[PDB]
Amino acid sequence: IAKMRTMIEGFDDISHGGLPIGRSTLVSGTSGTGKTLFSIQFLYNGIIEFDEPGVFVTFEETPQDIIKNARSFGWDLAKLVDEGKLFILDALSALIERINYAIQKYRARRVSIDSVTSVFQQYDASSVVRRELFRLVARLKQIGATTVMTTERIEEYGPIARYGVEEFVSDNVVILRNVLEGERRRRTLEILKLRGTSHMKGEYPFTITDHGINIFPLQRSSNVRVSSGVVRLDEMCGGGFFKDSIILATGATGTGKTLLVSRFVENACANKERAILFAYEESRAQLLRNAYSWGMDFEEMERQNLLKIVCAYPESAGLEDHLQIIKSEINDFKPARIAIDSLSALARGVSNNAFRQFVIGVTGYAKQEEITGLFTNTSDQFMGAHSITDSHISTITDTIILLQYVEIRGEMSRAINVFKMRGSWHDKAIREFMISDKGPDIKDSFRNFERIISGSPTRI
């Protein structure tokens, strides 16, 4: 079965090529899942990417309503209909024969039918629907047309379609979900069924933007080293960070993760390299005050157009939304390094399943475009080394910088340790460090101390 490249970002990987030629693909989903958007995109790409005649059969939406809605993504459907590339049929065996006419009228190779369940108010029997839907899809294959069929769902995990019959008649079934968990919405796409071919199984996160549908399916390694912004840190990292690596700074709240992130972004702009600080905790105003109090001027770095600062709320938007914002902001500014401050902020009110996929996408994209990523994470234990082990995220990252509070003679001191550095020697010392108006002052390790990992040493 030959497959029509839909050119929908992510879908051509998931469907192993695209939609089977001369075969009817069902696309069911609840209200506002983005069926119509998918339906139109299918034809838009095909028309303007392989000169492919495209016929859009409407039912509830007027051609003007359709055409107006698609101007959110900057698609001129009137222009394509003016050039005789599109063919919107305003609107069950008369339309069937009508459909074939337009197909022969413009040598049509792509059809989208939105929506195919609106047409079953006159019938309230799954039987009648089956028989009529069978005849429709049967005739389309006789023609040899590649059609995207749209139906509606009441439940996110119920029947595939309204009469639980539409999926068994169709050759290909794509399920669009808009799942609600924790008062937050996550769009996912599943290819359930492609008769006579293969595909990736399960749901995949996706987002709707001015681009349209953007699905996230799931040689290099350079020995070239980039600085952390801190000299002793570079020395304990056996010469500094690899350019194409993910570093994680983990420690309890106020250990100095953002100071580390500030130097790392400072250092970028001190070599005329661009950096994006993705803030998810403190806002721009605070970050600038604290940055400046450490002897770094982010306004200056933002003045030189070397720094970009993107602060959002870790629970305003879904994780796939944050993933797409990060991608576009990178594909735009073209940074040499990014900082995510922080991951633990993006992980709250999220399943470990969804958060892993997120991190993998950021990690993978950082590595595929050769951007040095420094991600922060606030440990939910006082003993930092236990928190690291109780996290799949810590085993995905290449370098781990552990920041740890240690109680010393009635004082709350802090230590730093390059916990892990894949592909390099690193210092194994748990070094005392102070924060001043000039930043990290990494001193010596605690030679006279046992159980430093606990955060409550005893003198040896």
Question: What is the footprint of ligand ATP within residues 219-258 (CB under 6 A)?
Answer: 251, 253-258
CB of 212 to ligand ATP, least distance (A): 8
Strand 411-421 and strand 399-408: the pairing is antiparallel
How many beta carbons lie within 10 A of that of residue 95, not counting itself?
A: 15
| Region of 90-98, 248-256, 270-278, 327-335 interacting with a copy of itself (CB under 8 A) | 248-256
Six-digit token string for 419: 């916990």
Residue 211 CB, nearest approach to ligand ATP (Å): 9
| C-alpha separations of 407 from 97, 308, 386, 410 in Å | 82, 37, 17, 7
Residue type, 407: E
The CA distances from residue 138 to 63, 161, 227, 279, 332, in Å, are: 26, 19, 63, 54, 46
Is residue 211 near a copy of itself by the rule CB under 8 A? no
The reply to whether 181 belongs to the active site is no
d(CA 275, CA 304): 12
- Known active-site residue 60: yes
For strands 431-436 and 458-459, give the pairing: unpaired
| Residue 232 annotated in ligand binding | no
| Residue 60 DSSP symbol | S
**Residue 412 binding result from a copy of itself, Mg ion, ligand ATP, none, given CB thresholds of 5 to 8 Å by partner type:** a copy of itself
Size of the residue set binding Mg ion (CB under 5 A): 3
- Residue type for position 397: T
Q: Which stretch binds a copy of itself (CB under 8 A): 42-50, 104-112, 270-278, 346-354?
A: 346-354
Considering only residues 100, 126, 413, 424, which one is a binding residue for ligand ATP as defined by CB under 6 A?
Answer: 424
Phi/psi at 320 (nearest 5 deg)? Answer: -70, -35
> Does 360 engage in binding with a copy of itself (CB under 8 A)?
yes
- C-beta of 257: minimal distance to ligand ATP in Å? 4
Of 61, 166, 190, 281, the catalytic one is 281
Q: Which of 152, 126, 118 is nearest to 26 (CA)?
A: 152
Q: Which partner, ligand ATP, a copy of itself, Mg ion, none, binds residue 308 by CB below 5 to 8 Å per kind? A: none
Binder among 208, 246, 362, 385 for ligand ATP (CB under 6 A): 208
Residues that bind ligand ATP (CB under 6 A): 29, 31-37, 72-73, 152, 168, 193-199, 208-210, 251, 253-259, 281, 290, 293, 378, 395, 420-426, 435-437
